[PDB]
């Protein structure tokens, strides 16, 4: 009886940094996925294990939409069985991922002359992230045997790094807004269905 709030996610004025990626829980609504795949603003629409054209006639207990901003070169890291700084330390998809990865260039929105340094990514982590794990820690990364005591220095690196988003940079360097759709069937009563 109520539309699923996909517009709040895809058209949001501000997107989160990839290390602190947002997640929108979608429940108890009717979703019209046609407004997504029939669009022309998307440069990447990669789905695994499900067809978007077949989503308007399926029911799920819950749907999750994750949003963040990364470089163009790192968009290929948002995929099952992928490896890299984004895939290992910021946002990780499972090997059996069932959902869609949607990306589009946002150089006009997320880039400014002189550099937009508001978007961050995690650079150092001792172990890879689990699938769908969010790590927002800002503690000094201890690269040696000496405790850092919260001050950056030798063998003590700040775990986060800033993107230097400038509008004149190459396409791979330009910011890209990414939305990842996750579809969950918990064998509970389903509340996220398509139109009837």
């Amino acid at each position, epitope marked *: 009886t109520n539309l699923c709030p996909f517009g709040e996610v895809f058209n949001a004025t501000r997107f989160a940094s990839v290390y602190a990626w947002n997640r929108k829980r979608i429940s108890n609504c009717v979703a019209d996925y046609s407004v997504l*795949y*029939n*669009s*022309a603003s*998307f*440069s*990447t*629409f*990669k*789905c*695994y*294990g*499900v*067809s*978007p*054209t*077949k989503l308007n006639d399926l029911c799920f207990t819950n749907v999750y939409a994750d949003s963040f901003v990364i470089r163009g070169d790192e*968009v*290929r890291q948002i*995929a099952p069985g992928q490896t890299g700084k984004i895939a290992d330390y910021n946002y990780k998809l499972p090997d*059996d*991922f*069932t959902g*869609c990865v949607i990306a589009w260039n946002s150089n006009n929105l997320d880039s400014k002359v002189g550099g937009n340094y508001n978007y961050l990514y995690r650079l150092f982590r001792k172990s890879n992230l689990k699938p769908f794990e969010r790590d927002i820690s800002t503690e000094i990364y201890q690269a040696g045997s000496t405790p850092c005591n919260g001050v950056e220095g030798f063998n003590c690196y700040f775990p986060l790094q800033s993107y230097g988003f400038q509008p004149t940079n190459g396409v791979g360097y330009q910011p890209y807004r990414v939305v990842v759709l996750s*579809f969950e*069937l918990l064998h509970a009563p389903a509340t996220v269905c398509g139109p009837k």
Partner: antibody
Amino acid sequence: EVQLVQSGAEVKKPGESLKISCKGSGYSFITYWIGWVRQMPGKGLEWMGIIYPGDSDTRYSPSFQGQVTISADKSINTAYLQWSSLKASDTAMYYCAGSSGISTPMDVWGRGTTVTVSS
Amino acid sequence: DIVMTQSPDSLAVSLGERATINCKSSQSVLYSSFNKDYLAWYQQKPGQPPKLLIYWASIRESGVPDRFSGSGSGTDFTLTISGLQAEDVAVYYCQQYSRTPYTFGQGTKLEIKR
């Protein structure tokens, strides 16, 4: 609805190179992976590979790894399948099939391209 | 790596009778916690490209008549034609798409049994 248009029939001598094309159009094509299927005269269907035109994400069948090259041109929505050197055993009909996402069925099919390799 | 074997190789069914085609999978064709068998059935009429009939082993695609039904789970799957018509003469392939590489069955030849 997505539609796939393939290149014309090819008649080649053994040893010559060949590149056939498959151009797609229609709404929701951004969600489509282009796969290639080989069917020799009177035989069954053989999956060769698949590619996503947006980032050229290509996956090959092990039976065709190193024998053919699969590429795409996202500016014209065209996927390609080429041989460096043709053999007479390459004589077959080559379909291109589109699927909305990977690990999904191929719901749209091209008309097919006949390739004849003979001396 | 997953081998699909169809039974029988050739089938002769009279008009209006029931056509049964079986597909056997060497491994399970599941993909995730979706609990769906990633199995598909295709129809190829003489001189025509293949046409997708059923996906997820039971869900017929848009435009496919109601006489086409798919059943089975695990490693055993079946395609059934309820009211056999002259239009249905074709070769029917089963395909798994759980993971790459995709593999087709050898195909089942279906003809009118007059």
